[PDB]
């Protein structure tokens, strides 16, 4: 479960080329991607 | 020189269309923004980005193939060795025109939303002409 | 006999290769990585412009700030935003004789591959698949180590003069006569650098008013020699006989560009094997085309001399053709004989002319005696002149290993480029982060390979090269093929649509 | 988007002219050769 | 236009020139003199025992037992040749030691080594000079510099030999063109390619008054001390130590390990800001195999010997200035070269007429000198392909192995055949 879930994060790190980035550059991308999705649900709910 | 031959790579047209499609989804998600101005922002941002990336930056990101013979040409002038009307140079001209009809139509042809898109479309169309290939107005970004 | 082409080229044996195209979903997902890297590189330049201290990279002297800037900031954009990030697996230093088992000096970085620092520990016993060691002549004990040690005691480390001056020994005269017997030509000449054989002899043949039909994927030395010659250059598609034959028509019925005068002569530059895109050239069709348009040929076989052919004579023996149909025949001693230097072979009228009008023969120093003697002793073993059977075994073993090793990768689901008989096996891995992951994983599993990027190949065609050898055993190949399978499953590198059936 | 076609019918006449000119420009450059700039 | 019959009629009529021109006349060369054994102090040329004044080992070191012992050990540990281009498992741990050792010897910051002496300066110049650049080069430069300048498609403006007035006059004119286009003169770099102790004339270049021009006209210097490395100065560091110039004012220094180190290869030294660029840009360093380890182990030991005994340069120069005094008086030959250079020339006074007659005339003194016991050679050039072709001459090279009596015999033996051929 957890071990098999870590492999998916590993595969996510290679597709987006986040594997070869500094740790402080990973946080920026992760936050900037979570915020977009989070504000794409508030709008979806208020427009339904 | 695999820089002038990047717009021939397998799946770059489809990966370029999806980029514009994704730009229109992060803009549509803003909690309080009307649809016409969303469409106007999409077109303006795409045109500004394409103008910067195709008609402003001169040179290669890597060491130049020849002894620096491409250091004074934008990415549009060196595309396909400067040979006009290739397959990609038709696509890159038709795309911002087709994207203009949609933003004219979704704005219900408002009088104030036509003086922004037209001035934007013209700016990314004038430089694509065969006569302006190598010309530099006044001296703006000559060297 | 086997099959014929419209040109006239005759193949005696089947000639087949595969260049499977990248799948669409994989092609789209690499542009995401490249765009992310570009965006973060821009955000890094601006941040390092004035904020980040970056007290590492050296700058210009305090007294030379008034001068014009030496370099261009945007010139080396990819060198410090892409390549640099994963450049921890390129200049790996070794500390042993390289073949089939190498020792590597361990090193680790603290500031993200900006300044390495050696620890002191040595990774002993690493399967080597990154150095050109066909026929396995790169060793430190054998019959060739005695001949090079005896000649190094009664001569020296090097000569101190030029061929036309007092720096022409009898060792060179002995070597140049034996190379001719090896290849099957009238005469030959030896130089002392493979790169300086192309860039210092091509300009002596053609000049202003001549045409060069160069190939798409030629080596750097060929291009540099062509540019120094002073002639017009036209590139045709890689290994396309319908594109090279169309360029030979418009070059004759249209003459020179402006004056529309006839060309003085037309020269064709090709190679036996292209290393990156491991593939063989179609000599029957290329020779059929030079006989119909009266062109000249210049074959460069550095990766095929000793690696192909039933006896190790190159591609000309691999096909069965006449070695007298090729005007100029280049090679190198540094990829199959475990030595250094180059050579050119051909007619006696051409070597006699190169002996006086070549930049190397008059301005550069000669070969060294200790390295010349090893070439002689080694090339006497392929011929079987030593009185043993250490020339057939290695030749037969290399082909055996290549045939066994390529089919096993085909049957696992990877994507392999090139002809079915080439000893260079490029694996395909398109993502720009899998380049950095593959080297790290392979070295962690005691296997040394080489990876190529975007400045050397096309945008979405990254790969890993797997130069084989005749010193590899069956056990070493099974061991290497095991960890490659586990790593390919871990990184999901099996893109083959039509996996081969065992 | 029901009012959009209604607006299109009421759209100013000078804007459809430009639209038609662009449509003609897209068809004029779609049937051209290649001619290297020499 | 041009139907398929005209097209095939034009293809059957074309006739190319042969790949090599037929010999129009008997060439002066094409007679490589064979050397039996090593080209040492007492060699055997064309089956005759004779002392050589032709090899370029100024310090001996070619038949030094200490140097051969240090190469045998690295031979029996590493093999003979590398199998890769220094970027694919081609870099050993002896290359790093040699590169670290050279920088310490030159008191510079970093070093880079090539595997061929000709390609070190023909690959360095085009790495820094580009299309829109201006290069001021001395008129009597060697062939490698010419090739490097041709590769770098840049503007080339050559001045006279050893006159600062012409260089300054040349630089002042370029200063005018800046005023006529200020926005273009801010993206063009300027270089001054100078070679200390020219091999084509045997003269030393003046640095003290050439460094001043760099700080007044903003132009960088490229030194090429490939013939003064290990010869000039109190410690054998070159011409910078000879004059007393700070090493940091030069920008880049190039030499080869084929003359004083008696090995194969070349190197470049300089600050770490300028040397680290050509690890990815130098054509001959990236796309080429690396130097064999036994050769590098021979250069390290030669460096050890030079560092341990710094009094060998004085005894080199003392007997270098001893034969340059006994060669004054030859009826017909004039000595061209400095009183300190170890390889000067011997031109022909009152030239006959054509270029071929002088070559034959000189080849008469060389052939006659070999009958006695003095091996000489004459300078060789590519007459068709060269900017400024020097006159015919006979090289005279001086090492530390030759005794003083031997030098006197050479000087007196080269005068008796010179006043009996040109008379």
């Amino acid at each position: 479960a957890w071990k098999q879930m870590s492999w998916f994060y590993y595969q996510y790190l290679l597709v987006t080329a986040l594997y070869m980035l500094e740790p402080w550059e990973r946080t920026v991308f992760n936050s900037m991607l979570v915020s977009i999705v989070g504000m794409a649900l508030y709008t979806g709910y208020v427009f339904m | 020189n695999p820089n002038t031959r990047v717009m021939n790579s397998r799946g770059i047209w489809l990966s370029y269309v999806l980029a514009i499609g994704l730009l229109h989804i992060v803009l549509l998600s803003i909690p309080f923004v009307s649809v016409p101005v969303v469409w106007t922002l999409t077109n303006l941002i795409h045109n500004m980005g394409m103008y910067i990336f195709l008609h402003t930056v001169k040179g290669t990101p890597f060491e130049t193939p020849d002894q620096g013979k491409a250091r004074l040409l934008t990415h549009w002038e060196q595309m396909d060795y400067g040979v006009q009307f290739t397959a990609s140079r038709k696509f890159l001209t038709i795309t911002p025109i087709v994207l203009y009809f949609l933003t004219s139509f979704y704005t219900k042809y408002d009088q104030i939303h036509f003086v922004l898109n037209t001035v934007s479309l013209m700016s990314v169309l004038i430089p694509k002409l065969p006569q302006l290939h190598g010309v530099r107005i006044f001296g703006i970004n000559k060297y | 006999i086997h099959h014929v082409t419209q040109n006239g080229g005759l193949y005696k044996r089947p000639f087949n290769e595969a260049f499977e195209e990248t799948p669409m979903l994989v092609a789209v997902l690499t542009y995401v990585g490249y765009g992310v890297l570009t965006l973060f590189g821009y955000l890094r330049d601006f941040l390092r412009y004035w904020r980040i201290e970056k007290c590492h990279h050296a700058t210009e002297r305090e007294e030379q700030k008034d001068f014009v800037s030496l370099y261009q900031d945007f010139e080396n954009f990819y060198t410090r935003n892409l390549y640099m990030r994963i450049r921890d697996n390129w200049n790996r230093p070794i500390c042993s004789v390289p073949g089939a088992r190498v020792d590597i000096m361990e090193r680790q970085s603290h500031d993200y591959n900006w300044s390495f620092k050696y620890t002191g520990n040595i990774i002993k016993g690493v399967i080597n698949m990154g150095s050109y060691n066909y026929l396995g002549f790169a060793r430190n004990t054998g019959s060739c180590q005695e001949a090079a040690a005896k000649v190094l005691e009664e001569y020296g480390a090097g000569v101190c003069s030029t061929r036309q001056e007092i720096g022409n020994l009898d060792k060179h005269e002995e070597l140049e006569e034996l190379v001719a017997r090896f290849l099957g030509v009238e005469a030959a000449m030896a130089y002392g650098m493979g790169f300086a054989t192309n860039s210092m002899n091509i300009p002596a043949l053609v000049g202003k008013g001549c045409l060069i039909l160069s190939d798409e994927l030629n080596h750097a030395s060929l291009v540099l020699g062509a540019r120094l010659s002073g002639a017009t250059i036209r590139i045709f598609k890689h290994n396309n006989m319908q594109s090279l034959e169309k360029l030979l028509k418009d070059a004759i019925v249209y003459g020179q560009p402006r004056t529309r005068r006839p060309w003085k002569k037309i020269l064709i530059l090709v190679e036996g094997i292209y290393s990156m895109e491991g593939s063989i050239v179609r000599l029957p069709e290329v020779i059929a085309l030079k006989k119909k348009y009266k062109a000249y040929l210049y074959l460069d076989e550095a990766h095929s001399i000793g690696a192909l052919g039933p006896t190790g004579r190159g591609v000309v023996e691999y096909f069965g053709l006449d070695p007298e149909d090729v005007d100029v025949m280049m090679g190198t001693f540094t990829k199959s004989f475990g030595a250094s230097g180059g050579y050119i072979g051909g007619k006696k009228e051409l070597i006699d002319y190169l002996r006086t009008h070549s930049h190397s023969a008059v301005y550069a120093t000669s070969l060294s005696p200790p390295v010349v003697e090893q070439i002689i002793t080694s090339m006497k073993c392929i011929m079987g002149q030593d009185g043993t059977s250490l020339g057939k075994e290695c030749v037969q073993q290399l082909a055996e290993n290549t045939r066994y090793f390529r089919r096993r990768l085909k049957e696992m689901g990877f994507i392999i480029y090139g002809n079915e008989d080439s000893p260079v096996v490029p694996l395909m891995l398109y993502m720009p982060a899998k380049i950095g992951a593959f080297g790290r994983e392979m070295l962690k599993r005691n296997i040394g390979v080489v990876v190529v990027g975007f400045p050397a190949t096309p945008i979405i065609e990254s790969r890993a090269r797997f130069c084989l050898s005749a010193a590899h055993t069956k056990e070493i190949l099974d061991t290497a093929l095991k960890e490659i399978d586990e790593v390919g499953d871990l990184l999901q590198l099996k893109y083959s649509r039509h996996r081969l059936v065992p | 988007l029901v009012e959009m076609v209604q607006a299109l019918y009421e759209a100013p006449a000078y804007h459809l002219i430009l639209e038609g000119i662009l449509i003609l420009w897209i068809i004029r450059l779609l049937f051209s050769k290649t001619y290297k700039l020499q | 236009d041009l139907t398929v019959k005209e097209k095939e009629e034009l293809i059957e009529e074309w006739q190319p020139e042969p790949l090599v021109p037929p010999v129009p006349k008997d060439h002066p060369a094409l007679n490589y003199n064979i050397v039996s054994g090593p080209p040492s102090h007492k060699t055997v040329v064309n089956g005759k025992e004779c002392i050589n004044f032709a090899s370029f080992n100024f310090l001996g070191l070619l038949d030094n037992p200490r140097v051969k012992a240090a190469a045998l050990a690295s031979l029996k540990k590493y093999g003979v040749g590398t199998c890769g281009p220094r970027g694919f498992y081609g870099t050993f741990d002896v290359h790093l030691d040699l590169e670290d050792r050279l920088a310490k010897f030159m008191k510079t910051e970093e070093a880079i080594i090539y595997s061929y002496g000709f390609a070190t300066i023909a690959s360095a110049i085009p790495a820094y000079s580009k299309r829109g650049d201006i290069v001021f080069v001395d008129r009597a430069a060697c062939f490698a510099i010419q090739k490097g300048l041709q590769a770098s498609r840049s503007d080339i403006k050559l001045f006279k030999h050893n006159d600062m007035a012409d260089l300054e006059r040349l630089l002042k004119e370029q200063e005018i063109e800046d005023q006529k286009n200020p926005r273009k003169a801010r993206v063009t770099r300027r270089f001054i390619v100078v070679e200390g102790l020219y091999m084509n004339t045997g003269t030393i270049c003046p640095l003290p008054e050439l460094v001043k021009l760099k700080y007044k006209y903003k132009a960088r210097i490229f030194l090429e001390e490939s013939l003064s490395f290990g010869v000039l100065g109190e410690h054998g560091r070159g011409v910078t130590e000879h004059y007393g110039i700070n090493i940091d004012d030069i920008d880049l220094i190039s030499a080869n390990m084929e003359n004083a180190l008696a090995s194969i290869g070349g190197f470049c030294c300089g600050r770490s800001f300028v040397i680290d660029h050509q690890r990815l840009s130098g054509q001959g360093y990236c796309f080429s195999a690396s130097l064999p380890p036994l050769l590098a182990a021979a250069a390290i030991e030669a460096l050890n010997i030079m560092e341990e005994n710094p009094g060998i340069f004085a005894v080199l120069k003392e007997k270098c200035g001893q034969i340059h005094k006994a060669l004054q008086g030859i009826s017909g030959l004039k000595v061209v070269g400095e009183s300190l250079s170890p390889a000067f020339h011997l031109q022909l006074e009152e030239s006959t007429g054509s270029r071929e007659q002088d070559v034959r005339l000189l080849q008469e003194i060389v052939d006659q000198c070999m009958n006695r016991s003095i091996a000489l050679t004459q300078a060789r050039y590519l007459e068709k392909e060269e900017k400024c072709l020097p006159p015919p001459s006979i090289r005279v090279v001086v090492t530390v192995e030759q005794t003083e009596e031997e030098l006197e015999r050479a000087a007196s033996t080269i005068k008796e055949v010179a006043q009996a051929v040109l008379l």
Side-chain angles (χ1 to χ4, degrees), chain E residues 39-105:
Chain E
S40 179
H41 175 230
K42 193 191 316 307
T43 180
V44 169
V45 192
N46 293 322
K48 309 205 216 72
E49 291 216 90
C50 58
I51 308 304
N52 62 354
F53 283 64
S55 294
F56 272 115
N57 63 6
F58 308 125
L59 282 73
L61 294 176
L62 197 57
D63 282 7
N64 199 306
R66 216 175 126 179
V67 170
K68 282 193 257 177
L72 172 61
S74 180
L75 170 65
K76 74 156 54 65
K77 163 206 202 274
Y78 274 125
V80 163
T82 72
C83 309
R86 188 118 207 241
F88 306 144
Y89 301 80
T91 184
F92 285 62
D93 74 330
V94 182
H95 298 161
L96 303 185
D97 197 5
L98 177 64
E99 273 173 35
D100 198 2
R101 199 74 199 273
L102 275 176
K104 247 160 282 167
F105 182 69

Side-chain angles (χ1 to χ4, degrees), chain C residues 117-132:
Chain C
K117 170 156 298 166
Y118 304 94
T119 72
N121 304 347
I122 288 170
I123 316 169
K124 289 146 200 305
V126 172
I127 286 159
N128 189 359
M129 305 215 80
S131 58
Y132 319 119

Side-chain angles (χ1 to χ4, degrees), chain C residues 382-396:
Chain C
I382 312 192
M383 312 216 245
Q385 231 141 87
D386 50 339
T388 62
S389 26
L390 276 11
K392 226 60 121 177
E393 317 306 297
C394 71
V395 168
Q396 219 240 286

